[PDB]
Amino acid sequence: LLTDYGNASASPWMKKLQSVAQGSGETFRILQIGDSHTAGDFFTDSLRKRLQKTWGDGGIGWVYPANVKGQRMAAVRHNGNWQSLTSRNNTGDFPLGGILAHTGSGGSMTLTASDGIASKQRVSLFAKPLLAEQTLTVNGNTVSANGGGWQVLDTGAALPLTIHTEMPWDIGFINIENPAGGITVSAMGINGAQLTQWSKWRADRMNDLAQTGADLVILSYGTNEAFNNNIDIADTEQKWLDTVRQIRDSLPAAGILIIGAPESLKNTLGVCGTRPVRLTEVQQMQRRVARQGQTMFWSWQNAMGGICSMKNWLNQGWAAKDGVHFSAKGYRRAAEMLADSLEELVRSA
């Protein structure tokens, strides 16, 4: 299911994962950026809880600053008055991820862990104050911007985490990491999004990517590309290649993993017809990009059983009735196979 068009065993990220496996105390950071499959967190959470069992619970990772409508964090619950805005339907000075929250004056936000660890964790926030040297608090402690513009605030706190804002800030993803090291899986999904739609985010987004410290970047798109009947494959392929180059420039030591689009259906009639007219071309394009960019490629369609499988997963309670989105059990099933492949690769090094 997983093809390596690069050299995983000899790569710096692999060497770091192995060190983490031996309990070196580092944090190995997995960042899946994708569409609605990613934004639901069912696929990514399965991946989270499994890889964390295998190599260590490094903490919840990069999570939303607030509740996002139609999207889901499994590993944190939100309680506050911030308002999330997303690039799905809107414009904005978005940091990497397509997500920001206006806090307003007198703003307040608390994130409480669906489980917990209650000891002081490492905390970073993407954040942009209205005014240059402005402040906010985290569990009562004063945390300060330097200059203005988007930046990462580095601090430390225990969960539950309460952020107060006397005057307005915009806040992006927030990083929460166990200081004992281990694995984090971060889910940066936008409902309906395509990979080329990083262009909706701010110009310095690659600078943001560099600040996430991701050691493995998983790109999960293709579904919505496939639903554009007039997509230019040739042109799209370039922008995919160029996006891969940019990732490599900004995170020279990261591994890159491309998840080929799973089978989706235009309609659900008669032995898994009908596929979107352009699905196959997008799938084949993704593999080509993987190979040229020396990336890893996980075939989600093969993982399902190959062509004509969506109706079967549909019949099996693994897919939604729309033939495009999966059920919770469906995502957990698919993520487990990815996990399998990842552990198989590392075991093989």
Please give the Cα distance from 27 to 30 (Å, whole number).
Answer: 10
Residues 52 and 12 in one domain: yes
Task: Give residues with Cβ within 8 angstroms of 101, minimum separation 6.
Answer: 64, 65, 66, 82, 83, 84, 85, 109, 170, 171
Residues 205 and 340 in one domain: yes
Helices (H), ranges, the chain: 12-21, 36-39, 42-55, 205-212, 223-226, 233-250, 279-292, 300-304, 310-315, 328-347
Task: Give residues with Cβ within 8 angstroms of 67, minimum separation 6.
Answer: 78, 84
Residues 294 and 253 in one domain: yes
Residues 231 and 292 in one domain: yes
Residues 301 and 193 in one domain: yes
Choose the final residue of a domain: 129, 146, 181: 181
Residues 227 and 128 in one domain: no
Task: Kindly tell me the sign of the dihedral angle through the C-alpha atoms of 165, 167, 168, 170.
Answer: negative
Residues 34 and 143 in one domain: no
Residues 234 and 317 in one domain: yes
Q: Where are the beta strands (DSSP E) in the chain?
A: 2-4, 27-34, 61-63, 76-80, 83-86, 99-102, 107-113, 121-129, 135-138, 141-144, 151-157, 161-165, 169-177, 182-189, 216-220, 255-260, 296-299
Which DSSP letter does residue 242 get?
H
Q: CATH number for the domain including 295?
A: 3.40.50.1110
Provide the token pair at 282.
Answer: 């997008």
Burial (Cβ within 10 Å: 0-12, 13-18, ≥19) of residue 269: exposed
Strand, helix or coil at 73? coil
Residues 263 and 128 in one domain: no
Task: Kindly tell me the sign of the dihedral angle through the C-alpha atoms of 114, 120, 125, 130.
Answer: positive
Choose the final residue of a domain: 133, 157, 181: 181
Helices 328-347 and 12-21 pack at an angle, to 10 degrees, of 100
Choose the final residue of a domain: 146, 181, 216: 181
User: Which residues form the domain of 79?
Assistant: 59-181
Distances (CA, A) of 70 to 84, 86, 143, 192: 12, 11, 31, 11
Please give the Cα distance from 45 to 48 (Å, whole number).
Answer: 5
Q: CATH number for the domain including 142?
A: 2.60.120.1360
Q: Domain tally for the chain?
A: 2
Please give the Cα distance from 48 to 76 (Å, whole number).
Answer: 13
